[PDB]
Amino acid sequence: GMHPNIATLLSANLGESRTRHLLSLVSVPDGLPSDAEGRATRAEIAQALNMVLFAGILDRVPTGRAYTDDVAATGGKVVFDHGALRTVKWRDNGALPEGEAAFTRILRPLGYRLNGNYPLDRISMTGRSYAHADAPEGIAQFFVSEFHPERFSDAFREAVGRVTGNSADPLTPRAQTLLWQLDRDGVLTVADGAELIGLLVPCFERQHGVPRLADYETLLRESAEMAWIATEGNAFNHATDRVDDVFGLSEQQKALGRPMKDKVEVSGSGRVKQTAFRADTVRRQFIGAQGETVERDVPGSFYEFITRDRFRVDLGFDAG
Protein backbone atom coordinates (compact mmCIF):
# COMPACT_ATOMS: atom_id res chain seq x y z
CA GLY A 1 0.00 0.00 0.00
CA MET A 2 2.65 2.51 -1.10
CA HIS A 3 2.97 4.21 -4.45
CA PRO A 4 6.10 6.34 -4.73
CA ASN A 5 5.41 7.79 -8.19
CA ILE A 6 1.85 8.85 -7.26
CA ALA A 7 3.09 10.13 -3.90
CA THR A 8 5.73 12.32 -5.62
CA LEU A 9 3.20 13.67 -8.12
CA LEU A 10 0.83 14.50 -5.20
CA SER A 11 3.54 16.01 -3.02
CA ALA A 12 4.65 18.47 -5.74
CA ASN A 13 1.06 19.71 -5.90
CA LEU A 14 -0.27 19.35 -2.34
CA GLY A 15 2.81 19.40 -0.10
CA GLU A 16 3.93 16.63 2.26
CA SER A 17 1.33 16.87 4.96
CA ARG A 18 -1.77 16.99 2.75
CA THR A 19 -0.26 14.17 0.62
CA ARG A 20 0.32 12.00 3.64
CA HIS A 21 -3.35 12.39 4.65
CA LEU A 22 -4.57 11.79 1.12
CA LEU A 23 -2.46 8.62 0.66
CA SER A 24 -3.70 7.17 3.93
CA LEU A 25 -7.33 7.97 2.97
CA VAL A 26 -7.78 7.24 -0.75
CA SER A 27 -6.95 3.80 -2.21
CA VAL A 28 -4.67 3.65 -5.15
CA PRO A 29 -5.73 0.96 -7.54
CA ASP A 30 -3.36 -1.96 -7.93
CA GLY A 31 -1.86 -2.80 -11.26
CA LEU A 32 -1.31 0.62 -12.85
CA PRO A 33 1.27 0.53 -15.66
CA SER A 34 4.81 1.55 -14.57
CA ASP A 35 7.90 2.72 -16.43
CA ALA A 36 11.33 0.93 -16.12
CA GLU A 37 13.19 4.26 -15.79
CA GLY A 38 11.00 5.53 -12.97
CA ARG A 39 9.11 8.03 -15.16
CA ALA A 40 5.41 8.69 -14.62
CA THR A 41 3.03 6.79 -16.81
CA ARG A 42 -0.26 8.26 -18.07
CA ALA A 43 -2.16 5.97 -15.67
CA GLU A 44 -0.13 7.20 -12.70
CA ILE A 45 -0.61 10.81 -13.80
CA ALA A 46 -4.34 10.34 -14.32
CA GLN A 47 -4.74 8.74 -10.88
CA ALA A 48 -2.63 11.51 -9.20
CA LEU A 49 -4.60 14.26 -10.96
CA ASN A 50 -7.82 12.65 -9.73
CA MET A 51 -6.57 12.54 -6.19
CA VAL A 52 -5.54 16.23 -6.30
CA LEU A 53 -8.99 17.07 -7.63
CA PHE A 54 -10.61 14.95 -4.90
CA ALA A 55 -8.61 16.83 -2.26
CA GLY A 56 -9.95 20.03 -3.85
CA ILE A 57 -13.54 18.72 -3.44
CA LEU A 58 -12.88 17.98 0.22
CA ASP A 59 -11.63 21.58 0.70
CA ARG A 60 -15.09 22.92 -0.28
CA VAL A 61 -17.44 20.07 0.70
CA PRO A 62 -17.28 20.10 4.52
CA THR A 63 -19.73 17.18 4.90
CA GLY A 64 -17.33 15.14 2.77
CA ARG A 65 -14.42 16.25 4.90
CA ALA A 66 -16.33 15.08 8.03
CA TYR A 67 -17.04 11.68 6.57
CA THR A 68 -13.50 11.18 5.29
CA ASP A 69 -11.97 12.42 8.60
CA ASP A 70 -13.85 9.55 10.30
CA VAL A 71 -12.58 7.11 7.64
CA ALA A 72 -8.98 8.13 8.27
CA ALA A 73 -9.53 8.05 12.02
CA THR A 74 -10.91 4.53 11.91
CA GLY A 75 -8.47 3.15 9.34
CA GLY A 76 -10.91 2.73 6.43
CA LYS A 77 -10.49 3.79 2.80
CA VAL A 78 -12.13 5.88 0.17
CA VAL A 79 -12.40 4.34 -3.32
CA PHE A 80 -12.67 7.30 -5.65
CA ASP A 81 -15.31 6.11 -8.10
CA HIS A 82 -15.97 9.19 -10.23
CA GLY A 83 -16.00 13.01 -10.27
CA ALA A 84 -18.89 14.69 -12.13
CA LEU A 85 -18.64 18.07 -13.79
CA ARG A 86 -20.77 20.30 -15.90
CA THR A 87 -20.20 22.30 -19.03
CA VAL A 88 -22.32 24.62 -21.21
CA LYS A 89 -22.94 23.61 -24.85
CA TRP A 90 -23.44 27.05 -26.33
CA ARG A 91 -21.59 28.99 -29.02
CA ASP A 92 -21.26 32.14 -26.89
CA ASN A 93 -18.64 30.57 -24.62
CA GLY A 94 -15.80 33.08 -24.79
CA ALA A 95 -12.43 31.36 -25.27
CA LEU A 96 -13.69 28.03 -23.90
CA PRO A 97 -14.56 25.19 -26.26
CA GLU A 98 -18.25 24.38 -26.19
CA GLY A 99 -19.69 21.76 -23.87
CA GLU A 100 -17.68 18.65 -23.11
CA ALA A 101 -14.96 19.45 -25.71
CA ALA A 102 -13.43 21.67 -23.03
CA PHE A 103 -12.59 18.48 -21.13
CA THR A 104 -12.40 15.65 -23.70
CA ARG A 105 -9.36 17.51 -25.17
CA ILE A 106 -7.79 16.87 -21.72
CA LEU A 107 -9.15 13.46 -20.72
CA ARG A 108 -8.50 11.77 -24.10
CA PRO A 109 -4.73 12.35 -24.15
CA LEU A 110 -4.62 11.38 -20.42
CA GLY A 111 -5.86 7.94 -21.54
CA TYR A 112 -9.66 8.12 -21.02
CA ARG A 113 -12.26 6.77 -23.47
CA LEU A 114 -15.97 7.38 -23.71
CA ASN A 115 -17.66 4.69 -21.68
CA GLY A 116 -21.38 5.63 -21.74
CA ASN A 117 -23.92 8.07 -23.10
CA TYR A 118 -26.67 9.20 -20.75
CA PRO A 119 -29.34 11.67 -21.99
CA LEU A 120 -30.76 13.75 -19.10
CA ASP A 121 -33.62 15.32 -21.01
CA ARG A 122 -35.64 16.21 -17.92
CA ILE A 123 -32.96 18.66 -16.91
CA SER A 124 -31.87 19.67 -20.46
CA MET A 125 -28.47 17.99 -20.21
CA THR A 126 -26.49 15.18 -21.82
CA GLY A 127 -24.20 13.17 -19.63
CA ARG A 128 -21.25 11.02 -20.74
CA SER A 129 -18.88 8.85 -18.75
CA TYR A 130 -15.12 8.50 -19.38
CA ALA A 131 -13.11 5.52 -18.12
CA HIS A 132 -9.40 5.11 -18.17
CA ALA A 133 -8.13 2.64 -20.77
CA ASP A 134 -5.32 1.38 -18.51
CA ALA A 135 -7.41 0.62 -15.38
CA PRO A 136 -11.09 1.28 -16.20
CA GLU A 137 -12.38 -0.20 -12.93
CA GLY A 138 -9.69 1.27 -10.68
CA ILE A 139 -8.97 4.82 -11.84
CA ALA A 140 -11.93 7.14 -11.15
CA GLN A 141 -14.24 7.81 -14.05
CA PHE A 142 -15.18 11.30 -15.19
CA PHE A 143 -18.84 12.06 -15.70
CA VAL A 144 -19.12 15.12 -17.93
CA SER A 145 -22.43 16.77 -18.53
CA GLU A 146 -23.42 19.36 -21.07
CA PHE A 147 -26.17 21.90 -20.47
CA HIS A 148 -28.48 22.71 -23.45
CA PRO A 149 -29.96 26.26 -23.48
CA GLU A 150 -31.85 25.88 -26.80
CA ARG A 151 -35.33 25.22 -25.50
CA PHE A 152 -35.37 27.90 -22.83
CA SER A 153 -36.76 31.43 -22.94
CA ASP A 154 -35.27 34.29 -24.89
CA ALA A 155 -34.42 35.97 -21.64
CA PHE A 156 -32.73 32.83 -20.35
CA ARG A 157 -30.63 32.28 -23.48
CA GLU A 158 -29.43 35.92 -23.37
CA ALA A 159 -28.58 35.41 -19.70
CA VAL A 160 -26.54 32.31 -20.56
CA GLY A 161 -24.42 34.21 -23.06
CA ARG A 162 -23.78 37.12 -20.73
CA VAL A 163 -22.58 34.65 -18.08
CA THR A 164 -20.46 32.38 -20.31
CA GLY A 165 -19.45 34.67 -23.19
CA ASN A 166 -16.39 36.03 -21.37
CA SER A 167 -14.97 32.65 -20.33
CA ALA A 168 -11.23 32.15 -20.24
CA ASP A 169 -9.51 29.09 -21.69
CA PRO A 170 -7.58 27.61 -18.76
CA LEU A 171 -5.70 25.00 -20.84
CA THR A 172 -2.39 26.75 -21.38
CA PRO A 173 0.15 26.08 -24.18
CA ARG A 174 2.52 24.43 -21.75
CA ALA A 175 -0.38 22.26 -20.49
CA GLN A 176 -1.08 21.16 -24.08
CA THR A 177 2.60 20.57 -24.75
CA LEU A 178 2.88 18.11 -21.85
CA LEU A 179 -0.50 16.47 -22.52
CA TRP A 180 0.42 15.57 -26.12
CA GLN A 181 3.98 14.42 -25.19
CA LEU A 182 2.24 12.14 -22.68
CA ASP A 183 -0.21 10.86 -25.30
CA ARG A 184 2.71 10.11 -27.62
CA ASP A 185 5.13 8.38 -25.25
CA GLY A 186 2.75 7.12 -22.55
CA VAL A 187 5.07 8.68 -19.96
CA LEU A 188 6.50 12.00 -18.80
CA THR A 189 9.35 12.53 -16.32
CA VAL A 190 7.93 12.63 -12.78
CA ALA A 191 8.73 16.41 -12.68
CA ASP A 192 6.89 17.04 -15.96
CA GLY A 193 3.92 14.96 -14.82
CA ALA A 194 3.75 16.90 -11.57
CA GLU A 195 3.92 20.11 -13.63
CA LEU A 196 1.10 18.91 -15.93
CA ILE A 197 -1.14 18.08 -12.98
CA GLY A 198 -0.57 21.59 -11.58
CA LEU A 199 -1.60 23.11 -14.91
CA LEU A 200 -4.64 20.93 -15.31
CA VAL A 201 -6.14 21.44 -11.87
CA PRO A 202 -7.22 25.06 -12.62
CA CYS A 203 -9.33 23.84 -15.58
CA PHE A 204 -11.73 22.28 -13.06
CA GLU A 205 -13.01 25.65 -11.95
CA ARG A 206 -15.22 28.60 -13.02
CA GLN A 207 -13.72 30.14 -16.19
CA HIS A 208 -16.20 33.01 -16.52
CA GLY A 209 -16.25 36.18 -14.38
CA VAL A 210 -18.61 37.05 -11.55
CA PRO A 211 -22.11 36.93 -13.02
CA ARG A 212 -24.86 39.53 -12.59
CA LEU A 213 -27.25 38.69 -9.84
CA ALA A 214 -30.13 39.40 -12.23
CA ASP A 215 -28.83 36.88 -14.77
CA TYR A 216 -28.30 34.24 -12.07
CA GLU A 217 -31.92 34.73 -11.06
CA THR A 218 -33.19 34.60 -14.67
CA LEU A 219 -31.43 31.26 -15.06
CA LEU A 220 -32.67 30.00 -11.74
CA ARG A 221 -36.31 30.52 -12.69
CA GLU A 222 -36.01 27.94 -15.50
CA SER A 223 -33.10 25.71 -14.54
CA ALA A 224 -31.47 24.97 -11.18
CA GLU A 225 -28.67 23.22 -13.09
CA MET A 226 -27.71 26.19 -15.29
CA ALA A 227 -27.96 28.52 -12.25
CA TRP A 228 -25.43 26.23 -10.49
CA ILE A 229 -23.12 26.33 -13.52
CA ALA A 230 -23.34 30.10 -13.43
CA THR A 231 -21.81 30.18 -9.96
CA GLU A 232 -19.51 27.11 -10.02
CA GLY A 233 -18.55 26.80 -13.72
CA ASN A 234 -16.59 23.62 -14.47
CA ALA A 235 -15.69 22.84 -10.83
CA PHE A 236 -16.62 19.26 -9.75
CA ASN A 237 -20.36 19.02 -8.89
CA HIS A 238 -19.64 15.98 -6.73
CA ALA A 239 -17.19 13.26 -5.92
CA THR A 240 -18.29 9.68 -5.39
CA ASP A 241 -16.90 7.02 -3.10
CA ARG A 242 -17.33 3.37 -4.01
CA VAL A 243 -18.49 1.42 -0.94
CA ASP A 244 -19.64 -2.12 -0.21
CA ASP A 245 -23.11 -1.14 0.92
CA VAL A 246 -24.76 2.22 0.42
CA PHE A 247 -27.87 1.20 2.37
CA GLY A 248 -26.03 0.30 5.55
CA LEU A 249 -23.77 3.34 5.19
CA SER A 250 -26.62 5.81 4.67
CA GLU A 251 -28.31 4.52 7.82
CA GLN A 252 -25.09 4.86 9.79
CA GLN A 253 -24.51 8.43 8.56
CA LYS A 254 -28.09 9.43 9.34
CA ALA A 255 -27.83 7.90 12.83
CA LEU A 256 -24.79 10.18 13.37
CA GLY A 257 -26.98 13.22 12.49
CA ARG A 258 -25.35 13.86 9.14
CA PRO A 259 -27.42 15.16 6.23
CA MET A 260 -27.93 12.18 3.95
CA LYS A 261 -30.51 12.50 1.26
CA ASP A 262 -33.41 10.17 1.64
CA LYS A 263 -33.44 8.76 -1.91
CA VAL A 264 -31.09 5.92 -2.94
CA GLU A 265 -31.01 5.96 -6.76
CA VAL A 266 -30.91 2.40 -8.23
CA SER A 267 -30.23 1.69 -11.93
CA GLY A 268 -32.81 -0.26 -13.91
CA SER A 269 -30.63 -3.36 -13.66
CA GLY A 270 -30.25 -3.00 -9.91
CA ARG A 271 -26.45 -3.22 -10.12
CA VAL A 272 -25.60 0.50 -9.54
CA LYS A 273 -26.89 2.18 -6.40
CA GLN A 274 -26.11 5.77 -5.43
CA THR A 275 -26.89 8.01 -2.47
CA ALA A 276 -25.40 11.31 -1.31
CA PHE A 277 -25.01 13.89 1.34
CA ARG A 278 -26.87 17.06 0.47
CA ALA A 279 -24.74 19.79 -1.04
CA ASP A 280 -22.99 22.17 1.27
CA THR A 281 -23.94 25.82 0.84
CA VAL A 282 -21.23 28.20 -0.42
CA ARG A 283 -20.82 31.95 -0.45
CA ARG A 284 -20.50 33.49 -3.91
CA GLN A 285 -20.19 36.91 -5.45
CA PHE A 286 -22.53 38.50 -7.94
CA ILE A 287 -22.83 41.85 -9.72
CA GLY A 288 -25.67 43.95 -8.44
CA ALA A 289 -28.07 46.27 -10.26
CA GLN A 290 -25.69 49.24 -9.95
CA GLY A 291 -22.53 47.30 -10.71
CA GLU A 292 -21.71 46.65 -7.03
CA THR A 293 -20.45 43.26 -5.76
CA VAL A 294 -23.03 41.49 -3.63
CA GLU A 295 -22.89 38.03 -2.07
CA ARG A 296 -25.33 35.18 -1.75
CA ASP A 297 -25.30 31.70 -0.25
CA VAL A 298 -25.94 29.15 -2.98
CA PRO A 299 -25.69 25.35 -3.33
CA GLY A 300 -22.15 24.13 -3.75
CA SER A 301 -20.98 20.59 -4.37
CA PHE A 302 -21.62 17.24 -2.60
CA TYR A 303 -20.09 13.90 -1.58
CA GLU A 304 -21.78 10.81 -2.90
CA PHE A 305 -21.65 7.07 -2.30
CA ILE A 306 -22.04 4.29 -4.84
CA THR A 307 -22.17 0.51 -4.78
CA ARG A 308 -21.44 -1.32 -8.07
CA ASP A 309 -22.26 -4.98 -8.33
CA ARG A 310 -19.69 -7.26 -9.96
CA PHE A 311 -20.58 -9.47 -12.95
CA ARG A 312 -15.84 -7.30 -13.38
CA VAL A 313 -17.72 -4.28 -11.96
CA ASP A 314 -20.75 -2.59 -13.61
CA LEU A 315 -19.30 0.84 -14.52
CA GLY A 316 -22.56 2.22 -15.92
CA PHE A 317 -24.57 5.24 -14.85
CA ASP A 318 -27.79 3.79 -16.35
CA ALA A 319 -31.13 5.46 -15.69
CA GLY A 320 -33.79 3.81 -13.46
Rounded CA separation 282/230 (Å): 13
In order, the DSSP letters of 89-117 are: --S--TTSPSTTHHHHHHHHHHTEEEEEE
Give the whole-angstrom CA distance, residue 304 versus residue 210.
28
Cα(5)–Cα(45) distance, integer angstroms: 9
> Which domains does the chain carry?
1-320 (3.10.180.50)
Instruction: From 248, 308, 309, 254, select the one nearest 277 (Cα to Cα).
Output: 254
Resolution (A): 1.9
CA–CA separation, 277 and 240 (whole Å): 10
CA–CA separation, 172 and 72 (whole Å): 36
Helix, coil or strand: residue 179: helix
Helix H or strand E encompassing 274? strand 272-276
With beta carbons less than 8 A apart as the criterion, state whether 76 and 24 touch: no
298/227 Cα distance (integer angstroms) = 10
Q: Is 269 helix (H, G, I), strand (E, B) or coil?
A: coil
Identify which of 13, 165, 187, 172 has the alpha carbon closest to the alpha carbon of residue 106.
172
Residues 137 and 252: their CA atoms lie apart, in Å, by: 27
Provide the 3-class DSSP secondary structure of residue 240: strand
Decide: 241 and 79 in contact? Cβ < 8 Å.
yes
* Separation of alpha carbons 317 and 320, rounded Å: 9
In this structure, the number of other CB atoms found within 10 A of the CB of residue 150 comes to 8
Q: How far apart are CA 36 and CA 48, in angstroms?
A: 19
Using only C-alpha atoms, the chain has a radius of gyration, in whole angstroms, of 19
CB 214 within 8 A of CB 289: yes
Spatial distance between the Cα atoms of 164 and 172, rounded to a whole number of angstroms: 19
Question: How far is residue 255 CA from its own chain's centroid?
Answer: 28
Choose among 237, 231, 258: nearest CA to 302: 237
